[PDB]
Amino acid sequence: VDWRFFGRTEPKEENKLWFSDKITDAYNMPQPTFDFRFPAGRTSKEAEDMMTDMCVMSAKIGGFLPGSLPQFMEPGLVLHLGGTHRMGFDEKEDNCCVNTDSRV
Amino acid sequence: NVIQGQLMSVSVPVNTLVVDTLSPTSWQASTFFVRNGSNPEQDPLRNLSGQA
Amino acid sequence: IKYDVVIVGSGPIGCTYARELVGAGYKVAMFDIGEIDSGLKIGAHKKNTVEYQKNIDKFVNVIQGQLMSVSVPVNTLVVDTLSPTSWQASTFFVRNGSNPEQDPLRNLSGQAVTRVVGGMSTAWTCATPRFDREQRPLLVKDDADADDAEWDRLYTKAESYFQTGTDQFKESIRHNLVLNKLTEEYKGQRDFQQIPLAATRRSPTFVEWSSANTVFDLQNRPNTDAPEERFNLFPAVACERVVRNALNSEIESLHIHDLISGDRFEIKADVYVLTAGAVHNTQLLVNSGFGQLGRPNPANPPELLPSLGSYITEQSLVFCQTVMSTELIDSVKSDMTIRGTPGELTYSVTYTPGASTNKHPDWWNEKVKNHMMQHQEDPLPIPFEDPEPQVTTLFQPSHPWHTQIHRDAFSYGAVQQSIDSRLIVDWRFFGRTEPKEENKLWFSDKITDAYNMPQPTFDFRFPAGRTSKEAEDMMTDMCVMSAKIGGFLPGSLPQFMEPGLVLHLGGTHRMGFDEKEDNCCVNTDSRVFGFKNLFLGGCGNIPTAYGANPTLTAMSLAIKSCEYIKQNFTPSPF
Amino acid sequence: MDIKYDVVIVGSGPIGCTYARELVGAGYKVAMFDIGEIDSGLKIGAHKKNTVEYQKNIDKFVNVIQGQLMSVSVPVNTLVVDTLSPTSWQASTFFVRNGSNPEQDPLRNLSGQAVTRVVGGMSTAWTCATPRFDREQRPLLVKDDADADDAEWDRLYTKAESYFQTGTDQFKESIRHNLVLNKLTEEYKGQRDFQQIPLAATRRSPTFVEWSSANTVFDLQNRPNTDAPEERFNLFPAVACERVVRNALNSEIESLHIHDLISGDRFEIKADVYVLTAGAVHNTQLLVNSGFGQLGRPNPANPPELLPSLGSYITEQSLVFCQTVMSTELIDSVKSDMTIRGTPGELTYSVTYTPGASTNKHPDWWNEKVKNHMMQHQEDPLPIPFEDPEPQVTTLFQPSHPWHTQIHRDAFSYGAVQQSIDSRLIVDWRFFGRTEPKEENKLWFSDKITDAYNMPQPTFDFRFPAGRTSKEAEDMMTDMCVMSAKIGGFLPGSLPQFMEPGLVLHLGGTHRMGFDEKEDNCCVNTDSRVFGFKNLFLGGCGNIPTAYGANPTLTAMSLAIKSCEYIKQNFTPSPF
Ligand SMILES: Cc1cc2c(cc1C)N(S(=O)(=O)O)[C@@H]1C(=O)NC(=O)N=C1N2C[C@H](O)[C@H](O)[C@H](O)COP(=O)(O)OP(=O)(O)OC[C@H]1O[C@@H](n2cnc3c(N)ncnc32)[C@H](O)[C@@H]1O
Ligand SMILES: Cc1cc2c(cc1C)N(S(=O)(=O)O)[C@@H]1C(=O)NC(=O)N=C1N2C[C@H](O)[C@H](O)[C@H](O)COP(=O)(O)OP(=O)(O)OC[C@H]1O[C@@H](n2cnc3c(N)ncnc32)[C@H](O)[C@@H]1O
Numbered sequence A: 001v002d003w004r005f006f007g008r009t010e011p012k013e014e015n016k017l018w019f020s021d022k023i024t025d026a027y028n029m030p031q032p033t034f035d036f037r038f039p040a041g042r043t044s045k046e047a048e049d050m051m052t053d054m055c056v057m058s059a060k061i062g063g064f065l066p067g068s069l070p071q072f073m074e075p076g077l078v079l080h081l082g083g084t085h086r087m088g089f090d091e092k093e094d095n096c097c098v099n100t101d102s103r104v
Numbered sequence B: 001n002v003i004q005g006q007l008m009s010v011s012v013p014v015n016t017l018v019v020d021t022l023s024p025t026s027w028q029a030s031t032f033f034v035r036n037g038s039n040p041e042q043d044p045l046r047n048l049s050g051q052a
Numbered sequence C: 001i002k003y004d005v006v007i008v009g010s011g012p013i014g015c016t017y018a019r020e021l022v023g024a025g026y027k028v029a030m031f032d033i034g035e036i037d038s039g040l041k042i043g044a045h046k047k048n049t050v051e052y053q054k055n056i057d058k059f060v061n062v063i064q065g066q067l068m069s070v071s072v073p074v075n076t077l078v079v080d081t082l083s084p085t086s087w088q089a090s091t092f093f094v095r096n097g098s099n100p101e102q103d104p105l106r107n108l109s110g111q112a113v114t115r116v117v118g119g120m121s122t123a124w125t126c127a128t129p130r131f132d133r134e135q136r137p138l139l140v141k142d143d144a145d146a147d148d149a150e151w152d153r154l155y156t157k158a159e160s161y162f163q164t165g166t167d168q169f170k171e172s173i174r175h176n177l178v179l180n181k182l183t184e185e186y187k188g189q190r191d192f193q194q195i196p197l198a199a200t201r202r203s204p205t206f207v208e209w210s211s212a213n214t215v216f217d218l219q220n221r222p223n224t225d226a227p228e229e230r231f232n233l234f235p236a237v238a239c240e241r242v243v244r245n246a247l248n249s250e251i252e253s254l255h256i257h258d259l260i261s262g263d264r265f266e267i268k269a270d271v272y273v274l275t276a277g278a279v280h281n282t283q284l285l286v287n288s289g290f291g292q293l294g295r296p297n298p299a300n301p302p303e304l305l306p307s308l309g310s311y312i313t314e315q316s317l318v319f320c321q322t323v324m325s326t327e328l329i330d331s332v333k334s335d336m337t338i339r340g341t342p343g344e345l346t347y348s349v350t351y352t353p354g355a356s357t358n359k360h361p362d363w364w365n366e367k368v369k370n371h372m373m374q375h376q377e378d379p380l381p382i383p384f385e386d387p388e389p390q391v392t393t394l395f396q397p398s399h400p401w402h403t404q405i406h407r408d409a410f411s412y413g414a415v416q417q418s419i420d421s422r423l424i425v426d427w428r429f430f431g432r433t434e435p436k437e438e439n440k441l442w443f444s445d446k447i448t449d450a451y452n453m454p455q456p457t458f459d460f461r462f463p464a465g466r467t468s469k470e471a472e473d474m475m476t477d478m479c480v481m482s483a484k485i486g487g488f489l490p491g492s493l494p495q496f497m498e499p500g501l502v503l504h505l506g507g508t509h510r511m512g513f514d515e516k517e518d519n520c521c522v523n524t525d526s527r528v529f530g531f532k533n534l535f536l537g538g539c540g541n542i543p544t545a546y547g548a549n550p551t552l553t554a555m556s557l558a559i560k561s562c563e564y565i566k567q568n569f570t571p572s573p574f
Numbered sequence D: 001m002d003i004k005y006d007v008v009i010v011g012s013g014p015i016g017c018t019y020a021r022e023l024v025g026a027g028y029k030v031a032m033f034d035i036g037e038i039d040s041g042l043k044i045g046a047h048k049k050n051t052v053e054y055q056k057n058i059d060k061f062v063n064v065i066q067g068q069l070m071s072v073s074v075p076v077n078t079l080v081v082d083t084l085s086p087t088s089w090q091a092s093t094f095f096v097r098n099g100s101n102p103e104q105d106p107l108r109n110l111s112g113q114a115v116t117r118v119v120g121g122m123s124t125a126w127t128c129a130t131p132r133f134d135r136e137q138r139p140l141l142v143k144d145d146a147d148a149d150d151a152e153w154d155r156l157y158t159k160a161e162s163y164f165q166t167g168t169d170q171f172k173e174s175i176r177h178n179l180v181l182n183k184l185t186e187e188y189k190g191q192r193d194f195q196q197i198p199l200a201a202t203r204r205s206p207t208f209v210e211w212s213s214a215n216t217v218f219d220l221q222n223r224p225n226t227d228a229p230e231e232r233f234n235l236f237p238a239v240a241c242e243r244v245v246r247n248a249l250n251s252e253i254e255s256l257h258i259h260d261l262i263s264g265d266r267f268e269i270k271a272d273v274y275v276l277t278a279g280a281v282h283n284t285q286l287l288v289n290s291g292f293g294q295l296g297r298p299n300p301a302n303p304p305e306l307l308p309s310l311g312s313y314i315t316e317q318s319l320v321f322c323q324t325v326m327s328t329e330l331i332d333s334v335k336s337d338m339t340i341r342g343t344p345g346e347l348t349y350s351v352t353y354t355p356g357a358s359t360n361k362h363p364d365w366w367n368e369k370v371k372n373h374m375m376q377h378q379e380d381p382l383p384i385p386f387e388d389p390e391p392q393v394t395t396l397f398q399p400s401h402p403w404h405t406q407i408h409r410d411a412f413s414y415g416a417v418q419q420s421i422d423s424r425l426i427v428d429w430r431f432f433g434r435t436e437p438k439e440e441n442k443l444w445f446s447d448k449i450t451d452a453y454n455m456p457q458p459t460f461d462f463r464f465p466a467g468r469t470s471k472e473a474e475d476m477m478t479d480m481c482v483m484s485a486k487i488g489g490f491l492p493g494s495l496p497q498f499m500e501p502g503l504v505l506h507l508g509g510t511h512r513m514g515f516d517e518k519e520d521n522c523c524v525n526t527d528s529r530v531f532g533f534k535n536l537f538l539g540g541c542g543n544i545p546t547a548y549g550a551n552p553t554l555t556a557m558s559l560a561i562k563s564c565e566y567i568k569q570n571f572t573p574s575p576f
């Protein structure tokens, strides 16, 4: 049995996806670059509590399979990236890009 | 394998692995220069390395 | 030719018999199959060199190089990328010293032995906890107070012999960080303390770890320091058999093989003491007509020591390492006023000495201040030479495992360079195993080992029921407790270790009050049932399910055994 | 500890022990210091593989070797660990950690270079191969007279061989040895010569070899003693030697500064003669910490005043390695003399041969071993006895193949260990290249970073020179692939590869010898005396100034013998 637990990450202004003005990708478009860390308080404390929960819960079923021991996966392997063009009611108050009709 | 073959990494930092068992006749780097489509803008320690 | 006492094995249990009995005026000989290997201090800890205390990671290799596997099943790995010209096997035949008796799925693959003077005490981690009642063999039946008093006396003496202490690591910032956080988190429900360690600190960067040598210096006697004592140690002597009289009431000789000359001799003593380890005591006994040689055959049960080699116990062992939390690292410098950016003109780190509101005492804040000011290139507040953590919460009925939360060298230990060593903490939890008649160490009647002795073979599974339920609860407990200090270090994720890599095998020649009722081989004086003059020492005596490290307990039994000898045999006039 | 001796020797390796052998024997009052400790049993400085347990378990000795090799210069680590838990303390930079050396360029290093600090030095662990160098690999000891040069080398090498107990027939009864030896002789008939590796060892039984070591050279026991009542020698382990004090004239050493590691105390030791035998790295370190050469990153805009060639022109050998699994043809050839009737395990099974038959391809002793193994071990499918000793074959360096070779089995730090393939089938191949000395290849010492003993941190600036050295290194790989194939294919997991630079541990030329300090770009003369100084001598592989592929220790020993002759003729032992 596979066990995959997925944490929630607080949105923080400093966590960014930006694009190079000099380096280009394979289609000749501005190269994506990340400036990302998991925020240090709730997100981090929940992430480790989440690991603990997986270890506790999975043990009710069976022990770990050697070679597939409990681990964090490489950041972003999960492919659930959000908030890069985020929604809210007000561009300024809600620090956002599109409204609730998804209109820019 | 099908999944792996269609996930292209978003941002790959410049590689600094040391390969010091090349034959003396092989062309050998003096620096960790930008190669193989890596992104010299990317801090390896503030990345989403698995993003694809 | 003739001795009062002959001791087989120079580990710490043999050296307990030597200490006691040489001291009491007996003419003693000790034989070890291995050779002198720790410098001028015979049988001392190999880790007590300056070089190894500066390079503790490297000592893992020393350990690996002296642990020889007990039973290796026939190898069935498929190599099908040989060149077509290379000689290529048609079957999985016996090779490279493998044991074809061994079922690879009912083994203790990690079990190994060390054949050097001082035995495994040349390499061990020096943890010497007492067993609580739940884990401890009874010495007195039906009087808990008298049993406690007997054990308290014996342990207190064993602790003197090993120079056990609980203070040698008190000035370690890492130690305190880890111990204090755990105590806070358990909110009274568990007790943490320093691992009791057989060691004496010599300086802030040097610890003299104990060993057999600390117990008994293994110097031949008489000598200038001991002009009236009599002791000879004979290394490179493979002890092969003890000869029984026809009554099975006495041992008449010890048969040995001198490995350097190749010759075989016998040795006469009044008293024979086997302290060759849990595996090799059993081997020597079986090779002597005790128990049963060969694959166990219940239809023809042995008439002598039928419990020999049955009810074997080995601990489950789980291991991980962690990387210290950001919270804990920031806590180290919590009393500091820090201004400016490291490396620049205006940077400063200060604290108020003696302030009652400081979290930490002055010696700590001074260390942290000076590290931070003197090493502005370094991003951590922990001094470079800070000693290792040495923390435990001892076995209790509500958490029936032993714990060590520490850094030290062991054969499966981990070595990496990417993460700063000051952040890394090892976690080892040891489970207790119920003794079960079906769990066996037996010896082949045809296959032999590298010393031409019957080949050891295990038939072992961890018992279902409580042992297994606890082992898995223990794993979870390690995952829960470690998380309070930091996440797992990649590459050292939580796992069970190969069965027997822990090297805590017990019960192979177990102790009890009554041979038949207690399914056992030695009585509480460690005397083999029926035999006037044959004693066994070591962890193989321990008949209980135990999770703590067993050597202190085995030494306590050996001291009691010595008291019986002193009471019952007279030393020869000197 | 007295404070005055006739001679002081830093280092108890085999080279230090050559000086002790010669000079204690000549009646000098000698003291020897080692930073490491007594570690091989009651035979002080002896080979650690000389236990009954290691000869029954040779593969375990690899771990012993690994545990006593401490890396010289470890660059700052830049591996990315991005699967830490979010709560774990996480680096923002690749900062200096775990004793790494921020002076070290990771791409111009000898990353495998390591040192051993134990009494006996590396001779407690080495593989005991002691070939002589031919003229092409060897420095000149006589100019302009090649036959005189050869005669002097033969004298010194013959003496060195006696000291080490070098021999070439301890493996002559091995079936695997002869199988391989003979096959290679045949395949290269009249193109290359194969022989047993000359090994510093004495066989004691069919299953036990007493490997030589420093202890063999000199037993390291304090003197006077019963066997040597008029000799004077004291060994002081756990003593870091830190500096030799130069007079202001730079013509004499005045004292040796030491640090007793057990007490913590520092002392000044006085001798008439000072001999540094601390290894190629540590000799150089001690001399630099004493004002020789130049401390800090090399700066040609102010060459040093004293010994400007110190730590330049360093050489380390290219090393290639693989293992093979013996060919079917070779295995069948072991039993070619046997007549076989029946099936193994049947009552009628019979393996016989005819002693002394003219048609036999092997001697009677070989056939008797094969027959007895086949008959006594009918479950075993190979004709090679279980206790058959290891192969120990070489074809020595020549101009048409300018590398040393070892076609053998033994324990080394990079050694391989698997359980799947029968060990009797396995042969190791190690080919060793010669490296041209070049001024730019350097071993220098930091003026800020310190090592674990508080001495200036060694740093390498090294690449294999780009022409002959490089072209030979790759031709050497090719040669290994070509030659090894005559024996069997490669063992998976031990494919042909270059080893990490300096793992080979044959570093030379760090304090190199020549006739003239300036013309020959060197540090010591042919008596191993430091130019300018009346009473300071260096011994070891750092003296060797040439490009050499063969194992260097026998050659370093021969130089030290010559050094001792000079000392004996110019300094008077104190009266006893
Ligand atoms: C290798 C190792 C072992 C330990 C540890 C770490 C490591 C890395 N750590 S922790 O990490 O596990 O936790 C321990 C620790 O902290 N605490 C502890 O109590 N035990 C530790 N062990 C286990 C103890 O070392 C072990 O319990 C005791 O040493 C056992 O003492 P003793 O009963 O004396 O056995 P021995 O194996 O040490 O010595 C036996 C000697 O007998 C010789 N011998 C064997 N057969 C012989 C024969 N036929 N003839 C003659 N001589 C013949 C052997 O050569 C040996 O010298
Ligand atoms: C580890 C190793 C080494 C070798 C081998 C295999 C293995 C597994 N093999 S093969 O596989 O390559 O082939 C060799 C072989 O077969 N043949 C050979 O010629 N050389 C081998 N080596 C190399 C030789 O061992 C080496 O050339 C000699 O030992 C050099 O002798 P010497 O020059 O005496 O150096 P040392 O390193 O042994 O001893 C130096 C002593 O100095 C001490 N020391 C250092 N600094 C000190 C200081 N500051 N103060 C006081 N003492 C201070 C050290 O403690 C040491 O004891």
Ligand SMILES: OC[C@H]1O[C@H](O)[C@H](O)[C@@H](O)[C@@H]1O
Pocket (backbone or CB within 6 Å): C019, C020, C021, C022, C023, C024, C566
């Ligand atoms: O056995 C007699 C005595 O021998 C010794 O001297 C031991 O040190 C001691 O504890 C013991 O009581």
Ligand SMILES: O=S([O-])[O-]
Pocket (backbone or CB within 6 Å): C249, C530, C531, C532
């Ligand atoms: O003969 S007595 O030992 O039972």
Ligand SMILES: O=S([O-])[O-]
Pocket (backbone or CB within 6 Å): C528, C529, C530, C531, C532
């Ligand atoms: O020897 S006793 O157990 O009868």
Ligand SMILES: O=S([O-])[O-]
Pocket (backbone or CB within 6 Å): D372, D373, D374, D376, D377, D384, D385, D386, D387
């Ligand atoms: O005949 S040998 O292999 O025992």
Ligand SMILES: O=S([O-])[O-]
Pocket (backbone or CB within 6 Å): D530, D531, D532, D533, D534
């Ligand atoms: O001291 S002189 O002879 O180089």
